[PDB]
Ligand binder design. Structure first.
Ligand code: CHL
Ligand code: CHL
Ligand code: CHL
Ligand code: CHL
Ligand code: CLA
Ligand code: CLA
Ligand code: CLA
Ligand code: LMG
Ligand code: LUT
Ligand code: LUT
Ligand code: LUT
Lengths: 222, 100, 122, 222, 221, 35, 44
């Protein structure tokens, strides 16, 4: 039910072991499990700002974490589709080879060679849409800065309040899941330099000696 | 062009800003003078880029310095660097270099 | 916003004010339908009710031709650029499936799907 | 240009929306760039304002101290190649010639970094401690963020509106210089060359000699 | 001394004039150096003061645990698998195992996954009990920051004046141990040697072996 | 011998700078007329 | 060679500059006049 996550006896960051809940986090907004051991959300309006950039961070981390492995998923046995650029942390070098930036292995898709020009178009367009996000325009102006839902919600869905509560905590949990997974993505890029799916296959081959303990010697300052 | 010119001299509007604010101007409307300069300068940039299109993509213009006595040459790798272009525009106008 | 530039008694015409007087437009165009430019030189407009009757034909015609223009420019561009469209050029696309031929769908970004549908059932 | 009041310029132009209620435009450098709201409490606002200004002054000083020596090195002043590029200047004290200011043997010529840092600690600790009190020997008690007096012998802080627009000029130039300084630390980490040398190589061919030419240097290997 | 407006501060005379209005020296270790202003609210005072105390204790144990094996290997004639504090993680990957006093009778562990599992479950239970401040009546009371009972068998939780004096002693020792452990951390990176060996090498030639002799080890080229 | 060049270049830029900022410096208002 | 000559005649020297000190003093003189004019601008 709703009170399982928005009641005063809601789900917490320790279950029934969160006795010293912060007073200001009463379970009104999505999440609100009380994990504020650093106490950086003491001020109310600042807590609002941190929550808004939390949901923005969460959504763009959802895009990132999902899009990490899709080219590596579509990677074939030898790689006519993509060469060394199938890996996530080698994707940018898809602009500097002799052919161009092909989306799915063919010249018919994208096929760009001016990284500076696509940089300029990206910057102008999405800086403009950030200005629309913070002020308003064609979609809406006086709506909720975090939760507008007017032109971006065409499939119904967003009409019921307990549905709002449920699938908003579904948002915050899925976003935090992608957020944590993305940290995994960057740090496995650092400590190993190997792709996620191929690391997963190497671990499922033999979990015993293949672990991060096998790379604990790599950062040793000899 | 001549038909349009005689039309605007004879039956064209006698004063422009009462019907076309985009085309009318008092000579102290400095913002709209700057707008007119912007339009004309965009036209001149378009003409220069048209010469670019001819020199690099339409296979024209004669180079006198091709071996054997010159050739009409489609220009590949033009030198656009600021050092040479500006040094070409800020040098002496005498026989030592020649300014322009 | 800014409906006066296209609607109302004073609107954009097919000729400007110096060459076209505002009285040379026939009476049944007074600035209430979209695209009202006062360009009816022959006797096809006749009256506003017949204008409304041809409006449905004109709008569906415009939308159909808009779909036709997009579906002409896209598959031939894909064929010329390298996509396996197998008949992207628009006025030979029917000649592909006569004896045992087929078609291919390039539905971006995950296209390249071989269609086994025969022409009679299609 | 009405740098104060409600009609002040903002941090996104017309698309900025509503500036925060706790920032109404009393202080220089005001544009409403408060996405995370670090400055909710006025005491915290004051501490961050002092930190920003001290960093602005230090960034301006570092900007000239990072541009001038390599300019003189390429303009006939006999700097060593070691000390011409700023991040290696501290290594010049380890050489037999010592630290030669402007390439002069009988100028500075320091060889004891231990004593140099010791006198540096003493002098700057005294200076910053006198800054912290607001009272110094011979200096009365006044504004700690804007002392003037002995620090303004020219007397340009006497007139109010010119003093305010000069405050705006100072904070904006400081922000520009701190962009520059963070950029110089970025080229120092990435390029390993001086910033003026980076601009010089960028002017040879701006198509390829830009930031995109170094995107594949820090990529990890398995 | 260390309490009230005549307490010691973070700059001595240089801090006599300007201090935050919200730092009165009530809490131990208060010298009033919050010049960044990251702590304006009492709620974050409570939470982040608890953060400071737990970091103080944990850095003290880290400092006592880093120098002990190297100070037992040198000047004491005791052998181990690997005496270096930041190289003691890799010593488990040899055939020897996890050795306590140079002898295979003690511990002799070779299952890092199992011992990490028991560490994480024990630590999770203990830390949840810490954050709970007790549960179901069992220690479900007390200070949650200064426990005393069930953790002070020596009976030094009484006489609050000298108790607070030793409390300030504790927070000062914790900050000094934070220095010591941070120094161990960065000396592991800029040099890659043991701190005891570093101290021993520095004593022979303090003019040559300093921080500046390794100041060019991270220059970019 | 380049010292002569430096001196004359300095004085030429000085006179030219006087000209440039003199006519930049609100020159059309230096008139007795009502303008 | 029998004499020391400037040897900069021609060669495409921008503004006739052959050594950096001359460009630096040109910029210095123009900046000096500019600073005088700017600080003494608005008549007063
Ligand atoms: C430097 C060389 C360069 C070259 C050779 C190409 C070549 C190409 N690029 Mg490009 N590009 C290049 C640089 C760059 N591109 C881009 C960004 C893009 C994008 C974003 C796209 C391309 C695409 C294309 C292709 C367009 C041809 C086509 O499909 O025609 C036939 C098609 C047309 C003539 C028009 C089709 C328009 C399309 C939007 C139709 C949509 C129809 C729907 C009904 C829309 C309905 C929406 C709403 C209203 C309901 C083509 C192979 C397209 C591609 O790969 O498509 C698969 C594409 O989408 N480029 C950038 C960044 C600014 C570049 C920078 O240098
Ligand atoms: C969040 C955005 C983002 C991230 C994380 C990356 C990451 C990367 N890009 Mg990249 N890019 C990003 C955006 C963009 N890139 C490009 C264009 C290119 C090109 C042209 C190339 C790359 C390449 C690379 C890789 C360089 C190798 C390396 O070790 O780098 C440093 C990365 C690490 C040490 C790993 C850890 C990353 C982690 C610290 C990042 C997360 C925090 C960041 C500070 C981001 C903060 C937000 C803002 C500033 C982006 C790398 C993994 C190169 C490549 O693929 O080479 C094989 C390459 O050639 N990018 C564009 C323009 C379209 C971008 C636009 O947004
Ligand atoms: C609605 C307008 C329409 C127009 C202008 C054309 C025009 C043409 N079609 Mg056609 N078709 C049209 C509708 C249709 N065609 C077909 C199925 C075909 C086939 C199967 C073929 C043509 C072909 C042709 C060309 C020669 C006949 C061409 C002139 C032929 C072609 O492309 O020859 C090169 C051809 O083989 N059409 C169908 C049923 C799916 C249609 C349904 O409306
Ligand atoms: C605050 C806790 C903590 C910290 C700071 C470290 C730090 C470190 N551990 Mg680690 N560990 C920690 C907890 C734990 N380690 C391990 C088990 C291991 C192993 C098995 C190994 C390390 C190793 C390392 C080092 C990685 C190489 C290096 O120098 O990287 C530079 C980074 C910082 C200086 C590094 C200094 C490795 C090592 O010692 O290599 C010589 C190693 O092999 N750790 C366990 C499980 C029992 C821990 C439990 O809490
Ligand atoms: C930068 C991302 C980010 C940001 C801005 C926030 C922000 C917020 N979180 Mg959240 N959280 C995140 C990531 C983030 N979180 C992730 C990935 C998880 C999954 C582990 C969680 C799980 C979580 C829970 C369970 C709860 C919150 C809550 C909150 C709110 C109050 C707590 C707070 O203010 O702490 C301050 C946060 C910051 C100052 C910014 C975080 C960035 C830090 C400083 C850098 C990285 C930290 C650390 C090094 C990461 C590495 C460790 C990793 C293995 C986890 C607040 C608006 C509480 C709430 O009330 O819900 C609304 C709540 O109980 N979060
Ligand atoms: C261009 C940057 C800039 C600007 C616009 C200002 C502007 C101002 N400062 Mg300031 N300052 C700066 C940089 C700047 N400062 C730097 C880098 C430092 C660190 C050394 C300081 C340290 C400082 C202190 C301690 C104080 C001020 C004060 C003031 C205010 C009154 C003084 C005044 O008007 O003199 C005129 C300002 C100018 C004419 C602009 C400066 C341009 C000079 C000529 C360039 C110098 C560069 C040159 C190569 C020398 C190298 C620097 C060297 C001295 C280290 C005023 C609004 C006083 C105040 O707070 O007001 C009450 C005061 O107490 N400043
Ligand atoms: C992570 C360890 C840690 C923590 C949690 C604290 C926490 C606290 N300190 Mg403390 N401090 C520390 C380390 C720490 N300190 C160290 C190592 C020193 C010696 C330099 C000091 C010296 C000190 C003094 C003199 C005082 C405090 C005070 C305080 C309290 C005031 C709130 C505040 O400081 O705002 C918020 C603080 C932060 C948000 C800190 C963020 C940390 C970032 C990462 C900056 C890192 C800086 C970098 C590592 C510096 C290099 C180390 C260098 C000094 C050698 C607070 C509870 C005041 C007090 O009254 O005591 C009760 C006070 O007077 N501290
Ligand atoms: C009026 C009508 C104008 C019609 C045409 C004018 C055409 C071009 C005029 C400018 C072309 C050159 C631009 C400057 C480059 C240059 O002069 O290089 C500087 C040249 C080069 O000087 C020589 O260069 C040689 C190599 O090129 C060698 O290096 C020599 O050593 C060096 O002396 O010397 C000059 O020409 C003297 C310029 C003096 C200018 C003073 C003008 C003051 C008058 C009015 C100011 C108004 C503003
Ligand atoms: C709350 C709290 C409380 C307590 O007490 C204290 C503390 C500790 C403070 C806390 C916590 C915190 C945290 C956890 C944080 C975290 C964060 C994160 C996660 C980040 C990341 C983050 C991350 C992220 C976003 C990421 C993202 C990603 C992305 C976009 C990607 C993109 C991409 C793609 C698609 C692909 C291609 O090829 C490339 C690119 C283009 C690049
Ligand atoms: C506002 C806000 C709000 C929102 O909301 C959020 C956020 C985002 C957080 C924000 C932002 C922030 C930022 C950006 C910051 C930054 C700053 C800086 C950059 C600084 C620097 C700053 C900088 C600086 C000081 C610098 C300095 C420098 C120096 C000293 C140098 C020195 C030197 C020299 C001379 C030379 C030699 O050879 C070397 C040396 C000796 C070394
Ligand atoms: C206080 C007082 C009072 C009394 O009474 C009077 C007096 C004496 C006047 C005074 C003093 C003052 C002062 C000290 C001043 C200073 C200033 C400055 C330093 C500025 C800078 C300023 C500076 C600055 C902005 C800087 C900037 C820089 C930059 C942009 C850079 C850029 C870049 C980069 C990124 C990189 C590349 O590779 C190159 C480039 C491209 C080039």
């Amino acid at each position: 039910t709703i009170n399982q996550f928005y009641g005063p006896d809601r789900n917490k960051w320790l279950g029934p072991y969160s006795t010293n809940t912060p007073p200001y986090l009463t379970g009104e907004f999505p999440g609100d499990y009380g994990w504020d051991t650093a106490g950086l959300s003491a001020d109310p309006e600042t807590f609002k700002r941190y929550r808004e950039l939390e949901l923005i961070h969460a959504r763009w981390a959802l895009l990132g974490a999902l899009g990490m492995v899709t080219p590596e998923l579509l990677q074939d046995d030898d790689g006519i589709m993509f060469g060394e650029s199938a890996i996530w942390f080698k994707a940018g070098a898809a602009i500097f080879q002799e052919g161009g930036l092909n989306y799915l292995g063919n010249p018919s898709l994208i096929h760009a060679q001016n990284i500076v020009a696509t940089l300029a178009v990206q910057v102008v367009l999405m800086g403009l849409v950030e200005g629309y996000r913070v002020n308003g325009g064609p979609a809406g102006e006086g709506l909720d800065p975090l939760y507008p839902g007017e032109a971006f919600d065409p499939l119904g869905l967003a009409d019921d309040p307990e549905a709002f509560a449920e699938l908003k905590v579904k948002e915050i949990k899925n976003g935090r899941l992608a957020m944590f997974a993305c940290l995994g993505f960057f740090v496995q890029a650092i400590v190993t330099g190997k792709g996620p799916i191929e690391n997963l296959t190497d671990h499922l081959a033999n979990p015993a000696e293949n672990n991060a303990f096998a790379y604990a010697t790599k950062f040793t300052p000899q | 062009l001549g038909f349009g010119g005689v039309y605007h001299s004879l039956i064209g509007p006698e004063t422009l800003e009462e019907s076309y604010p985009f085309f009318g101007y008092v000579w102290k409307d400095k913002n709209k003078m700057t707008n007119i300069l912007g339009y004309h300068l965009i036209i001149l940039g378009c003409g220069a880029w048209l010469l670019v299109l001819k020199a690099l993509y339409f296979g024209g213009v004669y180079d006198t310095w091709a071996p054997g006595g010159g050739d009409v040459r489609i220009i590949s790798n033009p030198t656009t660097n600021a050092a040479i272009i500006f040094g070409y525009i800020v040098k002496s106008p005498f026989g030592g270099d020649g300014w322009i | 916003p800014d409906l006066e530039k296209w609607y109302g008694p004073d609107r954009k015409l097919f000729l400007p004010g110096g060459l076209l007087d505002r009285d040379d437009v026939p009476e049944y165009l007074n600035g209430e339908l979209a695209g009202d430019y006062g360009y009816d030189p022959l006797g096809l407009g006749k009256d506003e009710e017949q204008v409304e009757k041809y409006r449905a034909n004109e709008l569906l015609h415009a939308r159909w031709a808009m779909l036709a223009a997009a579906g002409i420019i896209i598959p031939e561009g894909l064929q010329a650029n390298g996509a396996d469209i197998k008949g992207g050029t628009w006025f030979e696309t029917g000649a592909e499936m006569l004896n045992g031929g087929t078609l291919n769908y390039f539905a971006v970004p995950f296209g390249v799907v071989q269609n086994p549908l025969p022409l009679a059932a299609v | 240009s009405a740098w104060y009041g409600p009609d002040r310029p903002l941090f996104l132009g017309s698309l900025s929306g509503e500036p925060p209620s706790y920032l109404t435009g009393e202080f220089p450098g005001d544009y409403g760039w408060d996405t995370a709201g670090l400055s909710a409490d006025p005491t915290t606002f004051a501490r961050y304002r002092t930190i920003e200004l001290i960093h602005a002054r230090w960034a301006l000083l570092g900007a000239l101290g990072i541009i001038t020596p390599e300019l003189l090195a390429k303009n006939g002043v006999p700097f060593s190649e070691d000390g011409a590029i700023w991040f290696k200047a501290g290594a010049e004290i380890f050489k037999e010639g010592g630290l030669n200011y402007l390439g002069n043997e009988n100028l500075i010529h320091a060889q004891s970094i231990l004593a140099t840092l010791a006198v540096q600690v003493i002098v700057m600790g005294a200076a910053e401690g006198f800054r912290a009190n607001g009272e110094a020997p011979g200096v009365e008690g006044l504004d700690p963020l804007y002392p003037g007096g002995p620090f303004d012998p020219l007397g340009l802080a006497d007139d109010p509106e010119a003093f305010a627009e000069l405050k705006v000029k100072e904070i904006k130039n400081g922000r520009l210089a701190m962009f520059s300084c963070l950029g110089f630390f970025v080229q120092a980490i990435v390029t390993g060359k001086g910033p003026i040398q980076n601009l010089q190589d960028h002017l040879a061919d701006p198509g390829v000699n830009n930031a995109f030419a170094s995107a594949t240097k820090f990529v990890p290997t398995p | 001394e260390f309490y009230g407006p005549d307490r010691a501060k973070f700059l001595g005379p240089f801090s006599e004039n300007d201090t935050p209005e919200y730092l009165t020296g009530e809490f131990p270790g208060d010298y009033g150096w919050d010049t960044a202003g990251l702590s304006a609210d009492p709620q974050t005072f409570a939470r982040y003061r608890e953060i400071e105390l737990i970091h103080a204790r944990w850095a003290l144990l880290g400092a006592l645990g880093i120098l002990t094996p190297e100070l037992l290997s040198q000047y004491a004639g005791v052998q181990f698998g690997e005496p270096v504090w930041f190289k003691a993680g890799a010593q488990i990957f040899a055939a020897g195992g996890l050795n306590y006093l140079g002898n295979e009778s003690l511990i002799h562990a070779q299952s890092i996954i199992a011992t990490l599992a028991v560490q994480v479950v024990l630590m999770g239970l203990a830390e949840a009990y810490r954050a709970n401040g007790g549960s179901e009546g069992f220690l479900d009371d007390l200070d949650t920051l200064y426990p005393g009972g069930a953790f002070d068998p020596l009976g030094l939780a009484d006489d609050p004046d000298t108790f607070a004096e030793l409390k300030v002693k504790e927070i000062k020792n914790g900050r000094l141990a934070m220095f010591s452990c941070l120094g161990f951390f960065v000396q592991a990176i800029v040099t890659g040697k043991g701190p005891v060996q570093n101290l021993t090498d520095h004593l022979a030639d303090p003019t040559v072996n300093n921080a500046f002799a390794s100041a060019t080890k991270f220059t970019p080229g | 011998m380049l010292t002569l060049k430096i001196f004359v270049y300095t004085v030429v830029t000085f006179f030219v700078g006087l000209f440039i900022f003199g006519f930049l410096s609100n020159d059309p208002s230096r008139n007795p007329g009502k303008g | 060679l029998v004499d020391d000559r400037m040897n900069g005649d021609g060669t495409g020297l921008p503004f006739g500059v052959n050594d950096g000190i001359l460009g630096w003093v040109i910029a210095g003189t123009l900046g000096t006049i500019w600073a005088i004019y700017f600080v003494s601008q608005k008549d007063l």
